[PDB]
Tab-separated table of C-alpha atoms in Angstrom:
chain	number	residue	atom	x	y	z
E	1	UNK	CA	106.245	18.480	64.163
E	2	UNK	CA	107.551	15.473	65.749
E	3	UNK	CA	104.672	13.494	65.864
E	4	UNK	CA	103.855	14.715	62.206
E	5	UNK	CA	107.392	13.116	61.205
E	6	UNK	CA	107.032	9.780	63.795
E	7	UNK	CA	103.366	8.701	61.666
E	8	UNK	CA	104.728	9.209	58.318
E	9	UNK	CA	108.459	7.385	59.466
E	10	UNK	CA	106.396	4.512	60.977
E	11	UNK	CA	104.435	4.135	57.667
E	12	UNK	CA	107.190	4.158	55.855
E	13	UNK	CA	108.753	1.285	58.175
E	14	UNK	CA	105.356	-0.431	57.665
E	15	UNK	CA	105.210	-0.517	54.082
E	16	UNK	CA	109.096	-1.528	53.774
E	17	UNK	CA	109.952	2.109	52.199
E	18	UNK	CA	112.466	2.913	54.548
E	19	UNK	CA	115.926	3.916	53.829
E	20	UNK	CA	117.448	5.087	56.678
E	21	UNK	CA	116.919	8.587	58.157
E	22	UNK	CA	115.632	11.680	56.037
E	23	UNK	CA	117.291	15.772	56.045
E	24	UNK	CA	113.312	16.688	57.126
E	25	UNK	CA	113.717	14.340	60.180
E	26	UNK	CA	117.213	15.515	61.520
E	27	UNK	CA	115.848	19.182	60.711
E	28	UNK	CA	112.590	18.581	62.858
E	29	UNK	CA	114.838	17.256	65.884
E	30	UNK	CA	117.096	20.710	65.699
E	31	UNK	CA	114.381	22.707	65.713
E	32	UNK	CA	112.232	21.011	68.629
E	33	UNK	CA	116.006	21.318	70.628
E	34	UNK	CA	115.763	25.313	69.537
E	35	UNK	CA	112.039	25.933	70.434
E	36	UNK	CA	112.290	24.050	73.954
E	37	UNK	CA	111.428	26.523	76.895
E	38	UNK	CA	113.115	24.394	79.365
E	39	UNK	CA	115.611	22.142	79.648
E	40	UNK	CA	116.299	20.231	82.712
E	41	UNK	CA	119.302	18.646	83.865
E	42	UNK	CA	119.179	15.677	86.701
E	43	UNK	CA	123.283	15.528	87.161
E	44	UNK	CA	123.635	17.867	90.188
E	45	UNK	CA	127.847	17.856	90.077
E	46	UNK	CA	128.520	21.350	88.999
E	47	UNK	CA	131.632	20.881	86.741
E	48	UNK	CA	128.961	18.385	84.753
E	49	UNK	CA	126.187	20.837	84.860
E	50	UNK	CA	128.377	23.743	83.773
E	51	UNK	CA	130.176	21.603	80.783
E	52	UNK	CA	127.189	21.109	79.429
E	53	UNK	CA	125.633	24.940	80.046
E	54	UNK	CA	129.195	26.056	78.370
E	55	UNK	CA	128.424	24.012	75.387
E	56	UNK	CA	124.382	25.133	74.623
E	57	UNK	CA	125.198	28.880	75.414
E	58	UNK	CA	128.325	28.043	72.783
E	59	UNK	CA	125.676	26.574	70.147
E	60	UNK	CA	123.279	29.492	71.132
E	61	UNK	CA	120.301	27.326	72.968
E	62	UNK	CA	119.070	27.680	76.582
E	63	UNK	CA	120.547	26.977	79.855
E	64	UNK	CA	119.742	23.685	81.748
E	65	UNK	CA	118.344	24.011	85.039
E	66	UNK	CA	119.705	21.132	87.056
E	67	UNK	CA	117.701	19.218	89.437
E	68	UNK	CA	118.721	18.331	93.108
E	69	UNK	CA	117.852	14.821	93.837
E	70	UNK	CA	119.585	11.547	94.871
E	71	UNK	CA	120.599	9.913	91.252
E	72	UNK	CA	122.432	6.952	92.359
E	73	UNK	CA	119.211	5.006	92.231
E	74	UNK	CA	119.709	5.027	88.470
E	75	UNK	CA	122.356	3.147	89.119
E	76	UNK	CA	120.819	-0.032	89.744
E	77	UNK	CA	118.604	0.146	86.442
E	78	UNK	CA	119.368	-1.630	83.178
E	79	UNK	CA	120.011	1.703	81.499
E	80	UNK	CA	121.011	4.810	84.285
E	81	UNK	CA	121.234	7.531	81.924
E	82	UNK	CA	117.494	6.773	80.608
E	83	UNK	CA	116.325	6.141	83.565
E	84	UNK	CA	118.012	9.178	85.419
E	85	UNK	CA	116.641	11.014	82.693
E	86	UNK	CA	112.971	10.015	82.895
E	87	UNK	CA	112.955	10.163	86.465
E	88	UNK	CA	114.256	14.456	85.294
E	89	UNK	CA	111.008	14.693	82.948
E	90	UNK	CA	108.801	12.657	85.733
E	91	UNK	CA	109.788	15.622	88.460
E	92	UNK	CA	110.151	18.616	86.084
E	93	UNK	CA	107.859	18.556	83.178
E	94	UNK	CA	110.202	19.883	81.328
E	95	UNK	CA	110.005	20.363	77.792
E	96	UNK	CA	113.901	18.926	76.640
E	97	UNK	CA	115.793	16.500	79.536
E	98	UNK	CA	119.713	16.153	78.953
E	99	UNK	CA	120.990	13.404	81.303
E	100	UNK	CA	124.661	11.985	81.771
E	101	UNK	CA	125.171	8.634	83.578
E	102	UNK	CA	125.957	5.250	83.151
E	103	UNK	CA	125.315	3.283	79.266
E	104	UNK	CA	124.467	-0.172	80.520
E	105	UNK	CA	126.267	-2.995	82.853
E	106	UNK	CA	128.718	-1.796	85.981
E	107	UNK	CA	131.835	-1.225	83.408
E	108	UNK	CA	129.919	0.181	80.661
E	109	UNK	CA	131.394	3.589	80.863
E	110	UNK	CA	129.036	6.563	79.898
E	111	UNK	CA	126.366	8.148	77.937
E	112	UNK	CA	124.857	11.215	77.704
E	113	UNK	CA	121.196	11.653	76.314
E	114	UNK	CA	118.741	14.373	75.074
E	115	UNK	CA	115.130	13.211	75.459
E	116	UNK	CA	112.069	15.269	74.394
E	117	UNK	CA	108.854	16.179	76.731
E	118	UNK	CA	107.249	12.321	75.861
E	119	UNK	CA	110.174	10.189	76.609
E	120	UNK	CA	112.118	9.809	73.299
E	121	UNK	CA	115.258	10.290	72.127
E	122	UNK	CA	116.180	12.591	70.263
E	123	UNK	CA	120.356	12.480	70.610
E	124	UNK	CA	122.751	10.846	72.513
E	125	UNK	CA	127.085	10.665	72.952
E	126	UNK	CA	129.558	7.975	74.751
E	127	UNK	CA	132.608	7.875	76.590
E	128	UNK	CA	134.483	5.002	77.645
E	129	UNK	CA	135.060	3.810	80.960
E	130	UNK	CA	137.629	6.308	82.700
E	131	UNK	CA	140.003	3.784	83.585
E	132	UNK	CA	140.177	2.736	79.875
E	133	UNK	CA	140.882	6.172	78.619
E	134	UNK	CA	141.657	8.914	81.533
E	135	UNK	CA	139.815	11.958	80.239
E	136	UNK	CA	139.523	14.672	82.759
E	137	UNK	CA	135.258	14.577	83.313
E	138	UNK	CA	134.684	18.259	82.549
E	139	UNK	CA	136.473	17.442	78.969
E	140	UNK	CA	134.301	13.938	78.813
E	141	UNK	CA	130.766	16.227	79.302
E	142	UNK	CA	131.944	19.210	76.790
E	143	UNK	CA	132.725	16.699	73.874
E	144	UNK	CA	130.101	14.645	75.017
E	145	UNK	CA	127.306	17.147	74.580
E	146	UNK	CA	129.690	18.508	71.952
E	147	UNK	CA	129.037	15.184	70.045
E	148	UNK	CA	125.623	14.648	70.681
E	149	UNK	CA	124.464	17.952	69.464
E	150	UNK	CA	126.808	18.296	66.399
E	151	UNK	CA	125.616	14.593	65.370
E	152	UNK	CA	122.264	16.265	64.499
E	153	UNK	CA	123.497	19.019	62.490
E	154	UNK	CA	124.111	21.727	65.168
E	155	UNK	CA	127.162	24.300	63.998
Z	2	UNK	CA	128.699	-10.785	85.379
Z	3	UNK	CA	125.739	-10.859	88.550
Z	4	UNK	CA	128.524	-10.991	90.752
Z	5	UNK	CA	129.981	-7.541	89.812
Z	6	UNK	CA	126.439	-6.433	89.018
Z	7	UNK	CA	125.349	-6.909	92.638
Z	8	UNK	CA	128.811	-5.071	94.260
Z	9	UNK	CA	128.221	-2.301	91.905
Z	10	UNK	CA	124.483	-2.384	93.198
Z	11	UNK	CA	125.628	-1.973	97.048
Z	12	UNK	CA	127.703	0.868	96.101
Z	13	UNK	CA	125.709	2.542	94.720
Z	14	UNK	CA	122.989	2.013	97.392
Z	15	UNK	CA	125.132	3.121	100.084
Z	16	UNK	CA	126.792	6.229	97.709
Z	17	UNK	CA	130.076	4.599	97.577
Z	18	UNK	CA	130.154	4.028	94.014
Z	19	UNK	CA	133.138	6.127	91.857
Z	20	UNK	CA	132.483	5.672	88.354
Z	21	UNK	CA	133.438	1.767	86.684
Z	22	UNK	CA	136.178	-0.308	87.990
Z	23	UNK	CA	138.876	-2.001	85.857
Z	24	UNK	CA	137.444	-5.417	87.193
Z	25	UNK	CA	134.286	-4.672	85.901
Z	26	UNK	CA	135.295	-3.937	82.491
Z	27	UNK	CA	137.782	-6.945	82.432
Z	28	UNK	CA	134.830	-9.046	83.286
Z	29	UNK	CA	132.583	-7.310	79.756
Z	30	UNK	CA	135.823	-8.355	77.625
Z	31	UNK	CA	135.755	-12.170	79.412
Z	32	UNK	CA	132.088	-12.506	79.052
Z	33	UNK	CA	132.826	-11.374	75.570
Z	34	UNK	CA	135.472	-14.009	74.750
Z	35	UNK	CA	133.766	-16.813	76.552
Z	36	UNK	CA	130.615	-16.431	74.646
Z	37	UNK	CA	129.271	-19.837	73.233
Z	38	UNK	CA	127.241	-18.430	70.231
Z	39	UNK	CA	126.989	-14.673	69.046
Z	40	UNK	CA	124.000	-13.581	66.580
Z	41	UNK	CA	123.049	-10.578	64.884
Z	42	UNK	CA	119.619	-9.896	63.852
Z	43	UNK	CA	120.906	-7.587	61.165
Z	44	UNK	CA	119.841	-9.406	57.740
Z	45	UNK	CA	121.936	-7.326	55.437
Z	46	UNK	CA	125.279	-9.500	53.951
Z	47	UNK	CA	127.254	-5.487	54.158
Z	48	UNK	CA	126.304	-4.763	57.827
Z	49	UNK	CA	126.705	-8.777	59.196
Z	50	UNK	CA	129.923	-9.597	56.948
Z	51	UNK	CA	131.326	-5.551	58.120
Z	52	UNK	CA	130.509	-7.092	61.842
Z	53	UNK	CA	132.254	-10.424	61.022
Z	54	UNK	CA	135.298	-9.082	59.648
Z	55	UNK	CA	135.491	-6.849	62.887
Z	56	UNK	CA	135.212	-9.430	64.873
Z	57	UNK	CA	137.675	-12.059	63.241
Z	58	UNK	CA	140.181	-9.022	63.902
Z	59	UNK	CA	139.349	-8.691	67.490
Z	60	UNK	CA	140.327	-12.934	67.661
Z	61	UNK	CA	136.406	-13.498	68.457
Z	62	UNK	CA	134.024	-15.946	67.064
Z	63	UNK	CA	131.940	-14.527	64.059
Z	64	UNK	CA	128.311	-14.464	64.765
Z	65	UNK	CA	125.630	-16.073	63.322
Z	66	UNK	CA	122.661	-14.126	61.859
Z	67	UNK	CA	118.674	-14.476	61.857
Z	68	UNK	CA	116.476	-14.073	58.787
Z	69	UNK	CA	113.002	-12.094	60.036
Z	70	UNK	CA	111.722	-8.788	59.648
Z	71	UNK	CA	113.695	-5.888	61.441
Z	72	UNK	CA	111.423	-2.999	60.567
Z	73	UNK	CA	109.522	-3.474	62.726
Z	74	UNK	CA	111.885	-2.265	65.511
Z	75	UNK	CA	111.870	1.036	64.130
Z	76	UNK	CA	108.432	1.489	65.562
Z	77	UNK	CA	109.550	1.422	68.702
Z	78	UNK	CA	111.475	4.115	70.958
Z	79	UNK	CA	114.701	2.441	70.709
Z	80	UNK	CA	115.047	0.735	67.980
Z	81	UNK	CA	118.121	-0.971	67.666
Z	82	UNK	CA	117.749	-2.038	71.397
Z	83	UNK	CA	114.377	-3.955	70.270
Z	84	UNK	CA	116.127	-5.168	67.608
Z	85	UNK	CA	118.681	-6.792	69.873
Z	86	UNK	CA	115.778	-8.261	72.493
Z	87	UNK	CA	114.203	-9.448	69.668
Z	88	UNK	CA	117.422	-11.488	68.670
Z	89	UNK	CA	117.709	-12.879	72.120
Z	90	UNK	CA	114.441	-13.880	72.234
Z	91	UNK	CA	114.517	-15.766	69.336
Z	92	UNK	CA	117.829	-17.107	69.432
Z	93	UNK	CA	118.792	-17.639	73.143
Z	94	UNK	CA	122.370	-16.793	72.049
Z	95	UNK	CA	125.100	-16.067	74.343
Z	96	UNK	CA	126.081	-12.568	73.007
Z	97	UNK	CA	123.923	-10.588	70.737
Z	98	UNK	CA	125.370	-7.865	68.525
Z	99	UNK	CA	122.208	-5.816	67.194
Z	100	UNK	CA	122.553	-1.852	65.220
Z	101	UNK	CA	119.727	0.285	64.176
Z	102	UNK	CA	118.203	3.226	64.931
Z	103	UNK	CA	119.372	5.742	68.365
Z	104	UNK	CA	115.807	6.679	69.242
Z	105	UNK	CA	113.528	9.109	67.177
Z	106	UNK	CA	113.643	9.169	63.220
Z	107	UNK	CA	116.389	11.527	62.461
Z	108	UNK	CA	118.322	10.295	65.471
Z	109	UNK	CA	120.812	8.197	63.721
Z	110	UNK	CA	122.475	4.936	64.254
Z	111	UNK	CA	123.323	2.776	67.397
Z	112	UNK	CA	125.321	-0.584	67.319
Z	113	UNK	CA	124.960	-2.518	70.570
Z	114	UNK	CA	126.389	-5.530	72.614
Z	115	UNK	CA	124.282	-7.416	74.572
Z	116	UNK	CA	124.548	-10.250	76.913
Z	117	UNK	CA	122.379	-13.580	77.492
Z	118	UNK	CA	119.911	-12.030	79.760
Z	119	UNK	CA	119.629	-8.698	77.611
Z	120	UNK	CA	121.969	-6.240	79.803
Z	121	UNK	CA	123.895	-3.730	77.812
Z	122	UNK	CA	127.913	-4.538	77.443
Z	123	UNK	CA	128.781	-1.534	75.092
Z	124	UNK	CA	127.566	0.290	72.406
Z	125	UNK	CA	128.756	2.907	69.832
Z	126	UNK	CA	126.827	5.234	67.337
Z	127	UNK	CA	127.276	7.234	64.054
Z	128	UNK	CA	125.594	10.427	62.698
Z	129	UNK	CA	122.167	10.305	60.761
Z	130	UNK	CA	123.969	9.151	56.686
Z	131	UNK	CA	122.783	12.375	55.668
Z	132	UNK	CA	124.706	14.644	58.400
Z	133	UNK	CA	127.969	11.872	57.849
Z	134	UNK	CA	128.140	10.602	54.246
Z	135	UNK	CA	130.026	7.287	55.789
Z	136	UNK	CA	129.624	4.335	53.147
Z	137	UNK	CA	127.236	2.432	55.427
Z	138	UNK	CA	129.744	-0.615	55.805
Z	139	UNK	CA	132.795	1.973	56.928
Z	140	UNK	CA	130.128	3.390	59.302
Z	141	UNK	CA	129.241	-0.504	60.610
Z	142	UNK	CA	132.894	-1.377	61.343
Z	143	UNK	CA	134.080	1.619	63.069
Z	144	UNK	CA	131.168	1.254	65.084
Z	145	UNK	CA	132.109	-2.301	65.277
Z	146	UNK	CA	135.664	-1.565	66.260
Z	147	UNK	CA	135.035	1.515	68.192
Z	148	UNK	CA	132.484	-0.810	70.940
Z	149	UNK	CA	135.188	-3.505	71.145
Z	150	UNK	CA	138.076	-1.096	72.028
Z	151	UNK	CA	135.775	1.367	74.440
Z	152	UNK	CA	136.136	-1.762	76.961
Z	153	UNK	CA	139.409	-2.233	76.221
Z	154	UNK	CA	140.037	-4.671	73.373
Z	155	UNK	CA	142.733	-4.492	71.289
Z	156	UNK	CA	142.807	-5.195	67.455
């Protein structure tokens, strides 16, 4: 479906006929998100982990199986939470990656992502730095994946 | 900003690090201010004058913006990110302020801040139009504002 979606968006770009993003598109990412058979998590901090399984079993999708591997070599990437993520779908194979980490520079703050089995992105959420806005972390990942999934249509 | 880059690097490296430090953050908002020459490769007088007026609020210099074709980063995986590469590349501004599309089609919008050697300073994002019926300029300046005060600036 995705790819079905990706040629005819791209020839649209190409031909200057696009106007933003079309219902058929968002649709298409819901329903990939609904038909993955596994989801894999790299964040291996369980009050993360478990924020985020609270929120999918809450929207009625699959568990993520979280990965145990060192993730603070993210950290010294242009863009962690990509990069933590790919590194999850490099390992796994997995069909649907959700990764939390940092957005960009050291004081950044945060972003969570949901990537598909090729590398793209199909969602994503932010949080500010902590120290700008104290927000307990558990709360930060719940609205976070809250956010990114509700974005997209999810109810 | 390499100066905070490489202590957050060695924290990291030796699992020290605890999430962003106020310093770092301080230093986005100086490297913000100090910025000799901001541009936007967004063409469209709405999007670049909803920027401008965000800015002038903020008490920052409005940017400048290119004339070329943008579509073109919406064949790409990250769209507005290429967009913004594609403005420092061209430019060799300061401080580039770029928004397009998140990832995918369907994925929605992403308005970033990037510095002179095209590391990520902050971000913000906004439903698909069709999920959020924002008038487009409303949905450029809270994006605007919302980037600006994630970091800590205030209006």
């Amino acid at each position: 479906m995705l790819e079905d979606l990706i040629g005819k968006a791209y020839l649209e770009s190409a031909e200057d006929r696009r106007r933003g993003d079309r219902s058929e598109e968002v649709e298409a990412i819901r329903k990939y998100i609904r038909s993955a058979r596994r989801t894999v998590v790299p964040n291996w901090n369980a009050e993360k982990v478990d924020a985020i399984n609270d929120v999918l079993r809450s929207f009625n999708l699959r568990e993520a199986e979280h990965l145990q591997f060192n993730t603070n070599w993210a950290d010294l990437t242009r863009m962690p939470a990509v990069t933590k993520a790919l590194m999850a779908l490099d390992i796994s194979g997995a069909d649907l990656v959700i990764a939390r980490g940092r957005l960009g520079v050291p004081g950044s703050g945060s972003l969570l992502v949901i990537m598909d089995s090729r590398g793209r992105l199909l969602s994503a959420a932010m949080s500010p730095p902590h120290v700008i806005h104290s927000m307990e972390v558990r709360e930060a990942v719940r609205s976070e994946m809250t956010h990114a999934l509700e974005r997209i249509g999810f109810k």
